[PDB]
Amino acid sequence: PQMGYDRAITVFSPDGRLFQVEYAREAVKRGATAIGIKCKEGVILIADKRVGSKLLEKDTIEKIYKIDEHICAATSGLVADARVLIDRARIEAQINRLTYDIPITVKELAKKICDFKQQYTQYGGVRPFGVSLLIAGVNEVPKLYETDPSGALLEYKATAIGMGRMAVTEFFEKEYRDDLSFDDAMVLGLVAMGLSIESELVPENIEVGYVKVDDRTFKEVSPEELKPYVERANERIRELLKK
Amino acid sequence: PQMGYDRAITVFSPDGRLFQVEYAREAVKRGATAIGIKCKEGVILIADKRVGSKLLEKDTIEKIYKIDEHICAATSGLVADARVLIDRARIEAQINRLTYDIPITVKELAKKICDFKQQYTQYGGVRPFGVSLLIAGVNEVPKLYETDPSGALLEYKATAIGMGRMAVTEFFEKEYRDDLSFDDAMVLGLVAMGLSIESELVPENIEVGYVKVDDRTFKEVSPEELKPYVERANERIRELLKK
Amino acid sequence: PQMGYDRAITVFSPDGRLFQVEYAREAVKRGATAIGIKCKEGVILIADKRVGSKLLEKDTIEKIYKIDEHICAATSGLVADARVLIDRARIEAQINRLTYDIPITVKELAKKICDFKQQYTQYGGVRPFGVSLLIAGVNEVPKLYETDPSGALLEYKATAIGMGRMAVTEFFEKEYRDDLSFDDAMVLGLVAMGLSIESELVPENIEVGYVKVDDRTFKEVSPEELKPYVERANERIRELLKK
Amino acid sequence: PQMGYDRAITVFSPDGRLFQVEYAREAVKRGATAIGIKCKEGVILIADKRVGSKLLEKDTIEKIYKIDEHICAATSGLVADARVLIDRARIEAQINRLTYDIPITVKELAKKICDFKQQYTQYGGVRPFGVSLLIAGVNEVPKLYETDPSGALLEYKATAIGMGRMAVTEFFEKEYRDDLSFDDAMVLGLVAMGLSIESELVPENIEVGYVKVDDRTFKEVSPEELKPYVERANERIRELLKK
Amino acid sequence: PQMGYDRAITVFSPDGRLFQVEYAREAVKRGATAIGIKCKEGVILIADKRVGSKLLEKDTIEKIYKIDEHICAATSGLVADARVLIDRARIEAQINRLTYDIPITVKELAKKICDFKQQYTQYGGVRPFGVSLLIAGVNEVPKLYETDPSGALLEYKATAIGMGRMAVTEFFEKEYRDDLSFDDAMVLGLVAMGLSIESELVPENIEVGYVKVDDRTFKEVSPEELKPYVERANERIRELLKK
Amino acid sequence: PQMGYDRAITVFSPDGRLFQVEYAREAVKRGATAIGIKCKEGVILIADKRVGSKLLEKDTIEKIYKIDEHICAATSGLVADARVLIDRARIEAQINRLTYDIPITVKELAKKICDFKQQYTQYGGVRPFGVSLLIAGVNEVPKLYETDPSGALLEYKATAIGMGRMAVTEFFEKEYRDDLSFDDAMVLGLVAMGLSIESELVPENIEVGYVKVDDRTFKEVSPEELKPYVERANERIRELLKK
Amino acid sequence: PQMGYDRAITVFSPDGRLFQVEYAREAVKRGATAIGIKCKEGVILIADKRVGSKLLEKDTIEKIYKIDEHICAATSGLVADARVLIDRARIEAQINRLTYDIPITVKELAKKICDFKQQYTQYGGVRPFGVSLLIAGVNEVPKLYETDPSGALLEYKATAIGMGRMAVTEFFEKEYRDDLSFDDAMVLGLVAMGLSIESELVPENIEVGYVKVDDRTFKEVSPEELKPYVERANERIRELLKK
């Protein structure tokens, strides 16, 4: 964070860093937290959709976006930048079915959106995207990817982006199981969101989507199908939040 | 608001912000306030058209613009920038009927104008549009959208842009009803404008347009058809303005 | 007017302004004043053509320019910039007759020249035009438009640009009538120019052009046809200038 | 002349000026003075060709350039810039005979060279031409034009550019006659040059070219045909220079 | 490392250096160390894949990448930059089989990726890749190449990149044999990694790939086939680490 | 020579100058002096080819270059820049014979190379050529041209460029005759070079080329054909150098 | 070496210099020295290939590069830049055989690579090549060329580039003979390298290539064919190094 080397994406600092990329990362920190958790039977995406005003048509707010029948995605960072990236992913998913006449894999999609972001990182009159993404889906096996403003790509078993990344990360870091069940993964995910917010959850102010190995079809969970999971989740959240 | 990071749209500040976008937002704050309110049977747009001079051909001043038969729009911020954005929306509405041989939805239109604005946000020799828009219309259900200089897009039930956003927003925040009637929404809207200006309204210095679910046809209200609503509105405005 | 934000057209100031546009406006303030006045039967344009030297071939000086048979225009600001804008308007008028095989309206012409100016306002290696224009003519009804360096467009009943805008504006603001007659409008216009200059007029050092609803044909007034109007005008100018 | 706003042609100063254009004008001030005088029967161009060295092949020095059979031109300012502008005018004269199959008028030529100069005034990586021109000729009537580095264009009866503009201008301002004769105009012109230099003239160190209404054919005057005029001119110059 | 000459890739310093390239090299220093060792029967690549978190799907982490059947590669430096370079190498390998209908050599591949990197070193709006690569394979004889952010290319017998370059380099510098055997080269390589980390190795947190002269086919070694080598390696590492 | 206005070719100084052009001129001052002298029967070019080392293959050093059969040229300033300019002239000479199927004149060639140089004077990312040229030849009459880094073009009877311009210029200024003979011009030229160097000449360390009106064919003079002229030249040089 | 004028290749200093070019020259000074010596029967190139590490596959290190059957070349300065320049020369050699269906001459090749380097010297977003080259070969007669980062080109009888240019140059300056024999030239060359390094030579740490008038075919000398020459060379080196 040294002046003189931090206001031009194309300039390296004396200790080999791209401060404009690090600064862009500060933008995604401010976003509502989005969680991703994978298990044996599928992958889940949980996002916080609490709004500060009742004037917002929250009945139409979307935090988890369908990219293709089997690909899923969450967002964090600059709003407009995020939307553009998601449309880009969708277009990319369509191009694939045209060129190879088959659906694109989660890995290839995440990889293409990240190569795109990487380019907005090494040219002078260009600003990097101020957003991170969670790309989830099911190819032959479930998949969970996390992107970075610089274009870096990492595959996780469970993770998060936005305000509560730290909390969620440490929690999963201490209680995530390589063998959890879909419903366990679901609950564990909601609990995480809970610690993250430091409050019991309200099924109507959190969005959940997933893709299971059987259907390979993305689908959002209704607050009704979601209520039972929140109830169980709130139990432990309550139990852990201030003993 | 820190020098060194606030005079280039492509530069992030150390705390992850785009000050040139925030400054652009300062431009829309200076504009005449435009209100948007949605209800069961339709959506309404109310704009303040008071002029500081009698030399202006106010008989031809337009604050609410028809984009298509069912799409409506209000503006706030840099004048020339605004006009360009509205022509862009219209062109976009025509392209849709050509390509898909069907009318564009409110969501898609707002979405396309915002993707356009987003791009004037991440390239070096480009200035962001200094304006916010209220895109209103009726697809299958009424719709009210608010845009931002950065390209962000939000759906509301009721909101505002320009000088009186705060006032109008807090008022609606305390008395907007998810079940109001067209005429109620209308009056509530005029009242808001009233508090905003801190004065009883004059039907001839405010413009109102709307789109109802039945006709799906935009139409402006004549000061005559509007006079009764102002009278009722001024009653409450009078009652609330300084008790 | 704060250093740091005023030397790049694409930079917004902290209070949301485009200082380079405001500075450009300072250029039009220095120009000879041009007046525009509309009435029932037509529109009139009056410009001051007094020169500081007898060496100038003033017998060929033009302050009011014909754009098309029914469109008229005056200028104020940087000289070369102005000429370019007028040729642009003419070309634009020709393109219209080709594309739509019909004459362009005053509104559309003013609108196209302003969209052009707006663009020289949001790109990095471009300077805004330092000039304002008065576009006058007759479509179905008389028309008077005033342009701005930023591309803003406004329709007036009567107005002015250049040095004497203030004077002329306040005068019209106090004595312009929505029902004046051509000859009244003419005299009122000359009087304004008079106050503006603070001196009785000399028919040979002022240029007048107009477009009436009947002919829809632009034409300049000879100093002979103009002398009677000046005489009457000088009467009131004399009467008002220092009582 | 305020630092901060004077080293980029595209930047307006707080008081609406283009200092780089004003600075460019400082370049033409340093050039040998060129005079232009028009009369009933034609137009004349007189240029000072005194050189500081005998090594220069002054027998081939040209200060007045033929553009076309009826168009004439003088120069002042940066040398290389000037030459380029004159070749541009010639090319422009040829293009006209091709496109419209008729000779270009003096007005149109001057107008085209000025629109060209105007453009080198509103783009970032471009330097304005540091020169002014006197374009003279005969269309239906004699013509005398003066150009500016910014692209401004003015028509005169008599004028000058370069070092002695002031002197020559004030002199013509006090003794130019709208009805002078060719020979009178000629002498008056030489006298002006005289005051300008503050010395009697030497026919061999001044170049004169002209275009009369009868021939509409440009031609230079030999020092022999010119000697009689200088003699008469030197008489008055002598009479006026230090009484 | 002198300010004034170190923030523009195209600027040479007074002592003839490209500081932005030197700074880019500081980025590769921070990466996990990758080792390369060549012997009579083939070439080996060893990379450290220890992760700081159990949440990373390390079961899918790749530090050694297959470029073609006979070409191998390791990476160090900016993550996104590295991935882009490897895809570039693969594309380059395919182009070769198309154009010359034969596999590209290791030398030609390394050479093409380095010419590409060199270009991102001499143009103004371009940032150099912050990564070094180890390109290994078998043409007629085994090959080991090391790249630099500047595009420099060097052929080694044994070497390394990343954090432990120094350690590994000095070790090989004192005990590398021009005649070692595959298994010896393997062990020597693991030992180096050991000193580098200052700890006995764990077969599961190090990745090894190779290409032998017989098969000319790249293949990764399983932690099981690798365990015996680690055991022997840890013996000497233990023996050398703090006597 | 004022900081703030002297490091960008496109910026005019407050007193209307292009300092980068004046600085470029400082480069030609450092070059070996080249002399040009014209007479009745032809034009001559004399250049100093003294080298500071015997390791240079001076037997192949060329200071006077043939452009075409009748066109000749000398150089001074940046070496690489000069060569490029001469190849440009040659190409230009060939283009002429193709387009007009006739040889280009000296005037047109010099004019084309100068228009080219002028352009490297008014664009932002371009450096001006740091060289002056002496273009000599015979069209209908002998010709001698001198160029400038800015693109200015002047015709002389006798002149020089490089270190000894002053000396040579003053000498010719005092003893050049408009009627000298080829051999006189030759000797006078060598004498000049002599004063310039302040030493008697050595035929082998000076290059002479010429073009006479009869042959219109360029040809270099052998040190043998040149020895007699040097002998006579050294006589006067000796006589004038320190009396 | 004055700040303010030394960090932009396109800027001239007040005393007419291109400091970025002079700084680029500082880069070639740091390179291993390469020597070039010409004689009656051919041209020789000697380069120092001593490495600081045994890990480098020096058995494949190349300091002298074949450009074509008769053209040879050595390098000094930035590594990556050098390689690019040599590939450029080779491509250039191939283009020639295609276009003129004949081999390119040494002069033309050197000339083309230098015109290329000259261009990376006068454009704003471009960095100059930090390298000098020795281009050697045999056309009708042997040839030895030395290039410069600025694009300057010089022909020598004997010379050098890199660290030991001074030493080697002074030595040749005192003992080079215009009539030496191939073997003499060879020995003299090795001696030079010797003084340069201040140590007797080791045939295996120096590379020698040559092109004789008879074969016109480039070929490298084996350390075995080279050992006899080193032995003789070391004799004199020993004799001269510290008497």
Neighbouring-strand partners of residue C206: C48
Distance of CA A212 to the CA centre of its chain: 17
Tell me how close the Cα of E159 comes to any Cα of chain G, in angstroms. Answer: 7
Exposure string over A139-154, b if 16+ CB within 10 A, otherwise e: beebbbbbbbbbbbbb
Contacts of G90 (CB under 8 A, 6+ apart): G67, G68
Cα separation values, G191 from A201, C149, F98, G46, G227, Å: 85, 75, 54, 11, 13
Helix (H, G, I), strand (E, B) or coil at F49: coil
User: How many Cα atoms sit within 13 Å of G189 on the Cβ side?
Assistant: 32
Tell me if there are at least 3 CB pairs under 8 Å linking chains F and A.
no
Q: Decide if B56 and C117 are in contact by the 8 Å CB cutoff.
A: no
Amino acid found at B14: P
Three-class SS of G99-148 = HCCCCCCHHHHHHHHHHHHHHCCCECCECCCCEEEEEEEECCCEEEEEEC
Residues of D in contact with C55 (CB under 8 A): 156-159, 169, 172-173, 176
Report how far apart, in Å, the C-alpha atoms of C235 and of each of A112, A126, C149, C191 are. 79, 64, 36, 9
The DSSP code for A108 is H
Measured between CA atoms, the residue of chain D closest to residue F124 is D125
D114 CB-side CA count, 13 A: 27
Supply B50's token pair.
């008071």
Q: Which residue of C has its CA nearest to B84?
A: C115
Nearest-CB residue to G121 (from F6, F30, F80): F80
Are the beta carbons of D126 and F122 separated by less than 8 Å? yes
Q: Is residue D176 within 8 Å of D214, Cβ to Cβ?
A: no
Q: Which residue has the tokens 């969101």?
A: A193
Interface residue ranges in chain C relative to chain D, Cβ cutoff 8 Å: 1, 3, 6-9, 20, 23-30, 53-57, 60-61, 78-81, 83-84, 87, 120, 124-130
Q: Write out the H or E segment, with its range, that includes residue B187.
A: helix B182-197
d(CA C107, CA C90): 14
- Tell me which amino acid residue E184 is: D
Question: And the tokens for F179?
Answer: 């009627």
Give B152→chain A minimum CA distance, Å. 5
Q: Do C125 and B125 lie within an 8 Å CB cutoff?
A: yes
In order of F20, F76, F77, F83, F232, the CA distances from F133 in angstroms are 18, 7, 9, 11, 28
Length in residues, chain A: 243
Q: For residue B55, what are the β-bridge partners? A: none
Give the integer Cα–Cα distance in Å for F50 and G80. Answer: 37
Of C206, C173, C195, C158, nearest to C51 (Cα)?
C206
Measure B49 CA to nearest chain A CA, in Å: 25
- Give contacts of C169 with chain B, Cβ < 8 Å: 53, 55
Is residue B243 exposed (0-12), middle (13-18) or buried (19+ Cβ within 10 Å)? exposed
Query: Nearest to residue F114, comparing CAs of D30, D91, D79?
Result: D79
Mutate which of D2, D10, D12, D138 to disrupt the C interface (most C C-beta within 10 Å)? D12
Longest dimension (CA), chain A: 57
**CA B242 to CA B235: how far, in whole Å?**
13
Quick check: helix, strand or coil at residue D162?
coil
In 3D, which of A218, A41, A243 has the Cα closest to residue A137? A218
Say whether the C–E interface has 3 or more Cβ pairs within 8 Å.
no
Contacts of F1 in chain G (CB under 8 A): 14
C-alpha span between D14 and A150 (Å, rounded): 40
Please check whether residue C45 is in contact with residue C72, taking contact to mean a CB–CB distance below 8 angstroms: yes
Q: How far is G204 from chain E (nearest CA, A)?
A: 17
- Chain E CB contacts of A173 below 8 Å: 53-55
**What whole-number distance in Å separates Cα of residue C53 and Cα of residue C59?**
13
Q: Which two tokens stand for residue G179?
A: 């009539």
Q: Which helix (H) or strand (E) holds E103?
A: none
**Pick from C128, F151, F119: which is nearest to D127 by CA?**
F119
What's the distance, CA A237 to chain centroid?
22
The Cβ of residue A135 has, within 10 Å, a number of other Cβ atoms equal to: 27
As a whole number of angstroms, the distance between CA B135 and CA B85 comes to: 12
Contact (CB, 8 A) for D195 and D170: no
Count Cβ neighbours within 10 Å for each residue of G82-98 and write b for 16 or more, e otherwise: bbbbbebbbebbeebee
Phi, psi (rounded to 5 degrees) for G127: -100, 140
User: Alpha-carbon Rg of chain C, whole angstroms?
Assistant: 18
Answer whether C16 sits within 8 Å of B9, measured CB to CB: no
C99's tokens: 């594309």
Beta partners for E28?
none
Q: Which residues of G touch F (CB under 8 A)?
A: 4-5, 8-18, 111, 114-115, 117-118, 121-125, 144, 148, 150-159, 169, 172-173, 176
| Spatial distance between the Cα atoms of G204 and G207, rounded to a whole number of angstroms | 8
CA distances from B212 to B38, D60, E95 (A): 10, 83, 60
Domains of chain D: 1-243 (3.60.20.10)
Residues of D in contact with C28 (CB under 8 A): 16
Give the SS3 label for residue D240.
helix
Distances (CA, A) of C87 to C73, C99, C217, D111, D153: 11, 18, 19, 10, 14
Residues B205-242: b if buried by 16+ CB within 10 A, e if exposed: ebbbbbbbbeebebeebeeeebeebbeebbebbeeeee
- Chain A residue with CA closest to B8: the answer is A7
A230 near A190, Cβ under 8 Å? yes
**Residue-wise over D11-31: b if at least 16 C-beta within 10 A, else e?**
bbbbebbbbbbbbbbbbbbeb
Beta-carbon separation of D111 and C83 below 8 A: yes
The length of chain G in residues reads 243
* Residue D123 to chain F, least CA–CA distance (Å): 10
Residue D199 Cα distances to B99, D63, D226, F3, angstroms: 79, 20, 17, 38
CB contact under 8 A, B7 and C9: no
B and G: touch, per 3+ CB pairs < 8 A? Answer: no
> What's at E197, amino acid-wise?
I
Q: Which residues of C touch B79 (CB under 8 A)?
A: 150-153
CA proximity to B196, closest of B43, B35, B64 = B35
Distances from the Cα of F196 to the Cα of B188, F53, F182, F184, angstroms: 95, 21, 21, 18
> Are A155 and E24 an interchain contact pair (Cβ–Cβ within 8 Å)?
no
Other beta carbons within 10 angstroms of residue D60's beta carbon come to 14
CA–CA dist B24, B132 (Å, integer): 10
Tokens 């939000």 belong to B154
Cβ atoms of residues G145 and G110 within 8 Å: yes
Query: What SS3 string covers E154-200?
Result: EEECEEEECCCHHHHHHHHHHHCCCCCCHHHHHHHHHHHHHHHHCCC
| G near F: at least 3 beta-carbon pairs less than 8 Å apart | yes
User: Does the CA dihedral F226-F231-F236-F239 come out positive or negative?
Assistant: positive
Who contacts B170 (Cβ-Cβ below 8 Å, separation ≥6)? none
The Cα of F82 is separated from the nearest Cα of chain D by a number of Å equal to 19
CA distance C10 to C25: 16
Q: Could you tell me whether strands B142-147 and A42-48 are parallel, antiparallel, or unpaired per DSSP bridges?
A: unpaired
C172's CB contacts (< 8 A; 6+ apart) are B55, C37, C158, C159, C160, C188, C192
Nearest to A144 by CA among A161, A163, A120: A161
Question: How far apart, in whole angstroms, are the C-alpha atoms of residue E162 and residue G232?
Answer: 46
> How far is residue F120's CA from residue G119's CA, in Å, rounded to a whole number?
13
B53 vs D76: CA distance, rounded Å: 49
Instruction: State how far the Cα of F4 lies from the Cα of F11, in Å rounded to an integer.
Output: 10
What pairing do the DSSP bridges indicate for beta strands B206-212 and B42-48?
antiparallel
B/e letters for A7-25, b = 16+ CB within 10 Å, e = fewer, are bbbbbbbbebbbbbbbbbb
Q: D8 contacts in F (CB within 8 Å)? A: 11
> Cβ distance C32 to C75 under 8 Å?
no
List beta partners, residue F147.
F153
H or E element: which one contains B73? Answer: strand B71-77
SS3 for F214-241, per residue?
CCCCCEECCHHHHHHHHHHHHHHHHHHC
| CB spacing of C29 vs D16 below 8 angstroms | yes
Quote the CA–CA distance of B241 and B199 in Å, as a whole number.
Answer: 8
Tokens of B130: 């200094």
DSSP state letter for D71? E
Termini Cα distance of chain F: 39
Which one of A30, A57, A87 has the shortest CB-CB distance to B16?
A30
Place of tokens 């380097």: G117
Mutate to test the interface with G, among F11, F25, F76, F81 (most CBs of G within 10 A): F81
| d(C-alpha A41, C-alpha A211), whole Å | 9
| Spatial separation of the C-alpha atoms in residues C146 and C148, rounded to whole Å | 7
Q: Are C62 and D52 in contact (CB under 8 A)?
A: no
Handedness of CA E219, E222, E227, E228 (dihedral sign): negative
Is the separation of the CB atoms in C191 and C221 below 8 Å?
no
**Closest-CA residue to A132 (of A144, A105, A114, A155):** A114
In this complex, do G13 and F20 lie within 8 Å of one another by their Cβ atoms?
no
C-beta separation of G57 from E144 below 8 A: yes
Which neighbouring-strand residues pair with E76?
A: E132
Give the span between the Cα atoms of D82 and D198, in whole angstroms: 26
Q: Reduced to 3 states, what is the DSSP secondary structure of residue D154?
A: strand
Query: Which tokens is E130 given?
Result: 């912050």
Are D54 and F151 within 8 A, CB to CB? no
> How many residues does the structure list for chain D?
243
Pick from F123, F10, A3: nearest CA to D24: F10
Supply D177's token pair.
Answer: 């006659």
User: Looking at the partner chain, which of G60, G83, G130 has a beta carbon nearest the beta carbon of E16?
Assistant: G130
Solved with = X-ray
What Cα–Cα distance (Å) separates residue F119 from each residue in C185, D215, F19, F122? Answer: 53, 37, 16, 6
Cα gap G226→C66, rounded to integer Å? 89
D58–chain C nearest CA distance, Å: 32
Interchain proximity A12–E23, CB inside 8 Å: yes
Mapped onto helix, strand or coil, the DSSP state of residue F153 is strand
Q: How far is F242 from chain G (nearest CA, A)?
A: 31
Strand partners, G123: F126
The beta-carbon neighbor of C23 closest among D14, D111, D121 is D14
* CA gap C69, D23 in Å, rounded: 41
C205 alpha carbon, distance to own chain's centre: 17
Structure tokens at A49: 């959709």
Q: What is the dihedral of CA B49, B52, B54, B56, to 10 degrees?
A: -60
Tell me if B13 and A30 make a contact (CB, 8 A cut-off): no
How many CA atoms, within 13 angstroms, populate the side-chain half-sphere of residue D145? 28
DSSP string, G183-234: HHHHHHHHHHHHHHHTS---GGGEEEEEEETTT---EEPPHHHHHHHHHHHH
Q: What is the DSSP letter of F59?
A: G
- Beta strands C131-138 and E42-48, pairing class: unpaired
Cα(A35)–Cα(A189) distance, integer angstroms: 7
For B133, F184, G95, the CA distances from G88, given in Å and listed in that order, are 56, 50, 10
